[PDB]
Amino acid sequence: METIAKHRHARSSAQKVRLVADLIRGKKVSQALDILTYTNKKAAVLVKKVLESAIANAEHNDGADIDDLKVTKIFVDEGPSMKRIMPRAKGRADRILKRTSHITVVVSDR
Amino acid sequence: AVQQNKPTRSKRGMRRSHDALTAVTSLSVDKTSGEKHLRHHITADGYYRGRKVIAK
Amino acid sequence: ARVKRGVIARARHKKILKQAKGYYGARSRVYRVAFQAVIKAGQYAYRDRRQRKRQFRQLWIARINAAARQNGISYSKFINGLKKASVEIDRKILADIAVFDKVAFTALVEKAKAALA
Amino acid sequence: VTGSGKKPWRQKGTGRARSGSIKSPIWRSGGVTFAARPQDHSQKVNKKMYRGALKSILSELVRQDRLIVVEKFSVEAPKTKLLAQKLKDMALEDVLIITGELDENLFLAARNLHKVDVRDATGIDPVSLIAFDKVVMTADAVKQVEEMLA
Amino acid sequence: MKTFTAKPETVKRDWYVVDATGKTLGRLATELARRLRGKHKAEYTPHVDTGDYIIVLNADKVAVTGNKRTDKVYYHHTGHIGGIKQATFEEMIARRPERVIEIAVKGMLPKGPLGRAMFRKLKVYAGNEHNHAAQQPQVL
RNA sequence: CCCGGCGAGGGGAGUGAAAAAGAACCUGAAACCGUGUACGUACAAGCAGUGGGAGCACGCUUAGGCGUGUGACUGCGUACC
RNA sequence: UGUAACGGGGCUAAACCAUGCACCGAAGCUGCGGCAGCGACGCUUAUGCGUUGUUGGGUAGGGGAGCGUUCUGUAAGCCUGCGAAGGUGUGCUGUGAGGCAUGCUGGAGGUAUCAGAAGUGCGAAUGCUGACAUAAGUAACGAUAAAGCGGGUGAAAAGCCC
């Protein structure tokens, strides 16, 4: 386990955050910026400052090795609930959703 | 025409194969140790050695 | 009297039942199966634990016809000769020892051959 | 209820509707659906339901129960706590503190813990005949013929 | 305790040169099914999952014994119902080892189910003793 | 106390029985979801089955055929009202 | 509009008709279990258990019988902050509503007696109150008709500003 620095709160759907999360697992962390900071979508920027502020803690805050904290999962949940309106039809369609994103990072080691 | 059959289950939610990404590598090179990019030498002032574009 | 629809409602549907999958979303895992359609899961065997048996009958008799063919001792046409003896009725399953017994089972058809054959 | 009937509007022009009445006893803020009537009904009894072998339980039990002893005067009453010591002639100590006699005396102190409403004077109230251990009727021969209710 | 015998995958294959080709063809192309399944090898699983290895030798000898031979067609129309049709007949097509005039088991396992894995186990190499491209170990 | 954007959130302390009481204050499943233990698996048929059973992620057994679920083979069909 | 009259594949006799024979063989009567109804018996009799006969698909009608989230009552009566209890999935149990337990748990509660009948046993009212799993990367993205850098700065400038 060791760290879990999720961020809040985004403007996108949980799908947009979902697309880059999978690469980083268990054989990368030594250099965990590149892949995300070269893939500059508002998605991968979130997950990029999720990772830094997590592992920059773990090496001062447990006392572990920055290099071997393998990154064993990374999963995603929404919510609670955020709305607005855009009066396309003014009593029918009209109410645009904001699902949020926070990234349960879950680090642990090799 | 109005929505009138099955949800985004299995054969719709699955669709990920060509939504894909490039698993690109990166060069360490201590000539610019952290303001750098995968080969592009500095993300801002256009460095190599001396006075390039707006560097040094 | 207040009901609040409960107690017996999630009860008549799953509880202990050793069945993890079930019919997916709008047929089942929503609610819809629970009262009027969860009975179906036996109905493909509610008549057939009889009717199915016809398929496998050719297994047990195999061991009294596959080689016995080339001797002419043909299942359907041997059986009239045999049934002339009122103690020799139940050849149906009891002949199946013929699958391993071959090397001393070869003798069995000598017993009445003079008139049988 | 206050809610706007009766109907507000003509439900068309969507190819999807079914309801709009507002009240209607069904939907929201209200109420009791069943005519809103006050159900005040005295469920009447007849005269010889009391005369009426109702009193005859003391021949059903006969061994533990009606406990024929003495009339009520014996109670303190400003220390009714004490009557446990004196309730030993009937043996009963505290179980169901009645006596079912005929007169005005200090024995209303009996109901200090709940028990039952006591009643005493002549009408023994029939819901006191079913189903307690100690149906005490304890006073004298004031039972002759119609007097058995007492 | 069971009377059943699954897999069996495949325990009885009876490697046999089907010499009956042409000289009593339409008697035993009808029952190549009941052979792969049965009649000798019936002693394990004569209905379910099993496989066999029968040995092919010739193909263009169909014999067939009736007027049927020079006027019965076959049709595939493989794309969009064909439109423009075909009209070759049985002793004219059999010249080629194809998919409809030579396997027989096509018509006896007649849909695809249970047949879906046992297409070319019999090889269908055709050309007599010059073309014994089958099993090196000793076939019957 | 520690990291980061002189931020968001967590990892330990902690008033505390409790943060599964943390100010998107309810001691608390529902429509739908993410990473995973193993399945079936990019030649698909027909309410996706309960059968009949191979052995597989795992578990108990002085050996004793069982405690476990997607469900190779295919059989049976049309669950409604 | 793909040869498409047994479902095929047409079988030169395997057939077609007459004569022999034993296998398959719906839920169809048999093995032998359990038994609701209206009858007959051996006796019992508050009555019932077995024998014997008729026999066991069930929306129009009349018979006549099981049980609950808990309210009004069984009960300062015994039960529980040593857990009284759900969502759940240990183990068997009724002919069944479902449980007597229970398994891993919760954090206040009960009716194995019978008295009680009505906010009365829900998924189909073209749902309703508030919703959204859903229509994909869901505007013509705000007409298609404008832009070019060198900078000043900074927590980040197609825009600010020179």
8 Å CB contact between D23 and D5: yes
CA angle E28, E32, E36 (to 5 degrees): 150
Q: CB contact, 8 Å: B7 with chain C?
A: yes
Q: Which residues, at least 6 apart from E78, have a Cβ–Cβ distance to it below 8 Å?
A: none
Q: Does B38 sit within 8 Å of A34, measured CB to CB? A: yes
Can you give the distance from the CA of residue D59 to the C1' of nucleotide F27 in angstroms? 57
Nucleotide nearest to E101 (CA to C1'): G9
8 Å CB contact between D107 and D75: yes
The answer to whether the Cα torsion of D66, D71, D77, D83 is positive or negative is: negative
Token code pair at residue D17: 């509707």
DSSP string, chain E: --S------SS-----B-TTTTTTHHHHSTTHHHHHHSTTGGGS-TTSS-----B----S-----SGGGGT------TTTS-SS-----HHHHTTS--SSSS--TTTTS-SSTTTTT-SSTT----SGGGG--S-SS---
Token code pair at residue D74: 């014996």
Q: Which residues, at least 6 apart from A101, have a Cβ–Cβ distance to it below 8 Å?
A: A9, A10, A12, A13, A14, A16, A17, A46, A76, A78
Which CATH number is A59's domain given? 3.90.470.10
Nucleotide nearest to C19 (CA to C1'): F69
Q: Which of chain B's residues have a Cβ under 8 Å away from the Cβ of C24?
A: 9
Q: Look at the block and give the residue holding tokens 């249970």.
A: E114
CA C73, CA C108: separation in Å to the nearest integer?
12
8 Å CB contact between A91 and A9: no
CA D102, CA D137: separation in Å to the nearest integer?
10
CA E130, CA E114: separation in Å to the nearest integer?
33
Q: Which residues, at least 6 apart from C96, have a Cβ–Cβ distance to it below 8 Å?
A: C60, C63
- Closest-CA residue of C relative to E34 is C58
Residue type, E134: A
- Burial (Cβ within 10 Å: 0-12, 13-18, ≥19) of residue C62: buried
In our burial notation (b when 16+ CB lie closer than 10 A, e otherwise), range D93-115 reads eeeebbbbbeeeeebebbeeeee
Mutation site for E-interface testing, chosen from C54, C55, C58, C102 by largest number of E Cβ within 10 Å: C58
Q: Is C35 helix (H, G, I), strand (E, B) or coil?
A: coil
8 Å CB contact between C66 and E39: yes
8 Å CB contact between A91 and A42: no
Q: How many A/B residue pairs have CB atoms within 8 Å?
A: 16
Work out the minimum CA distance from B10 to partner chain C, whole angstroms.
Answer: 11
CA E104, CA E29: separation in Å to the nearest integer?
5
**Coarse DSSP helix, strand, coil percentages of chain A, rounded to the nearest 5 percent:** 30, 10, 60
Q: CB contact, 8 Å: B50 with chain C?
A: no
Domain that holds residue A84: 1-110
Which CATH number is D102's domain given? 3.40.1370.10
CA C81, CA C112: separation in Å to the nearest integer?
10
Helix (H) / strand (E) containing A59:
helix A42-61
Q: Which of C76, C69, C65, C52 is nearest to C98 (CA)?
A: C65
Residue type, D147: E
Mutation site for A-interface testing, chosen from B26, B29, B35, B40 by largest number of A Cβ within 10 Å: B26
Instruction: Indicate the resolution in Å.
Output: 9.0
Token code pair at residue E109: 């396992």
8 Å CB contact between E43 and C99: yes
Whether A90 has a binding-site annotation, put simply, is: yes
Work out the minimum CA distance from E93 to partner chain C, whole angstroms.
Answer: 36
Nucleotide nearest to C51 (CA to C1'): G26
Q: Which of C54, C55, C61 is nearest to C98 (CA)?
A: C61
CA E15, CA E34: separation in Å to the nearest integer?
15
A98: which strand partners?
Answer: A82
Kindly report which amino acid residue has its CA closest to the C1' atom of nucleotide G69: C7
8 Å CB contact between E106 and E95: no
8 Å CB contact between D71 and D139: yes
Domain that holds residue D125: 1-149
Q: Does E5 sit within 8 Å of C62, measured CB to CB? A: no
Q: Is C104 helix (H, G, I), strand (E, B) or coil?
A: helix
Nucleotide nearest to A16 (CA to C1'): G137
Q: Which of chain C's residues have a Cβ under 8 Å away from the Cβ of B11?
A: none
Q: Which of E86, E32, E35, E24 is nearest to E61 (CA)?
A: E24
CA C38, CA C32: separation in Å to the nearest integer?
9
Residue type, E43: E
Asked whether C and A share 3 or more beta-carbon pairs under 8 angstroms, the answer is no
Q: For residue B15, what are the CA distances in angstroms to B18, B20, C26?
A: 8, 11, 22
